[PDB]
């Protein structure tokens, strides 16, 4: 049983960060070094584990979360970061054990005129908790008056478009991100 990371890393479609995907992987064997040695990743940052060992450490289930952000936001997908993404979209715990892997996806995920498909959350009444998801699209009440389903003054659509344009600077081009979270408990994933 080889772990199906192929379905995660090489999927034809990803997600907006606000609606980040999780694939739960357990009961399988995987070659982490096949991943670690791939030249196709521009970022591969790990916390609590080295890429060259992963084949040897076992774990009780791994969660693989995935989404799309801009290049200049990849630094927010790390422990202890702040910002719109970490605060209102996808927060990592302080005690994160695992890796953050990103690569430029401009060739796949950009569209002439701007992509309208990928969104991020602009506003929320409070910061997200670690590994929380919020997929509501309720009109945001910024003032003293209920919106009752109508957008306008102090009644804001909570999502903003990334508008990924093929001609964007690398900082503003789309990057695909996979976060591997390793959990230990009783009794799995293991190497060859």
């Amino acid at each position, epitope marked *: 049983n080889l772990c199906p990371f192929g379905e995660v890393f090489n999927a034809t479609r990803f997600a907006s960060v606000y609606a980040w995907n999780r694939k739960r992987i357990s009961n399988c064997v995987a070659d982490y070094s096949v991943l670690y040695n791939s030249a196709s990743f521009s970022t591969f940052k790990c916390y609590g584990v080295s890429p060259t060992k992963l084949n040897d450490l076992c774990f009780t289930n791994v969660y693989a979360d995935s989404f799309v952000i801009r290049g200049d936001e990849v630094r927010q997908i790390a422990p202890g970061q702040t910002g719109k993404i970490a605060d209102y979209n996808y927060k990592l715990p302080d005690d994160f054990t695992g890796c953050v892997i990103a690569w430029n996806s401009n060739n796949l995920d950009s569209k002439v005129g701007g992509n309208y498909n990928y969104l991020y959350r602009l506003f929320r009444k409070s910061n997200l908790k670690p590994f929380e998801r919020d997929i509501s699209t309720e009109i945001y009440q910024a003032g*003293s008056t209920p919106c009752n389903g109508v957008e306008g*003054f*102090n009644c804001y*659509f909570p999502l903003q478009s990334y508008g990924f344009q093929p001609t*964007n600077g690398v900082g503003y081009q789309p990057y695909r991100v996979v976060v591997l979270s390793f959990e230990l408990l009783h009794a799995t994933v293991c190497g060859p």
Partner: antibody
Amino acid sequence: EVQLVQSGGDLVQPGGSLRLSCAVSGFTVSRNYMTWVRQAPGRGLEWVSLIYPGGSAFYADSVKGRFTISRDNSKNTLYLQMNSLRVEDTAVYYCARDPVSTGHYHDSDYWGQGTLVTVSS
Amino acid sequence: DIQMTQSPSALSASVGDRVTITCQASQDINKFLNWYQQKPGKAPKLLIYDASNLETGVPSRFSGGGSGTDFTFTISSLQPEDIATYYCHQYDNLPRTFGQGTKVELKR
């Protein structure tokens, strides 16, 4: 309508401290973006700090550590804590909310009346 | 930081002349550039947001455009009520920065 009022500024000394107030009428402060900007004596405009609606706050590369930004949701008022004041911080100060441009909506930014702050001893 | 270089420092023109101010960024800021107008001793106001779009109430004679590093501002026909000091401001790459400013001046 919408209005912002700034107060609590006067002469201080090097190493002193001063709190700036910015009352708001029209929108809830705790649920909206907000920033402070610095208008030097007869010179350009300078960004000081911002606070995301939800807690997170960010400062300039000079007021960092020396300054702080906060808010009180009851009185619905904004506050700028300026500690270890230098002369280089002597200027006018403005409180404003970030412009909006979600989906099929767009609105400008609202600014306060501005308060003068002097550090010279 | 992303420094913003705005030209010209001083500008004097007559009524009806088209005026083009400029603001370059040291790094790509995409379309997240706002142009502000400040009249002598008063709070600045937002005219052009998202580097091109006009805010409500802004006359059609104001227009701007650009994406990336170089950014352009322009009034097609100068009006006496347009005499002020204009600044460029990026707001997507923290820390936020402004421009030095351009003082529009009438020509007698």
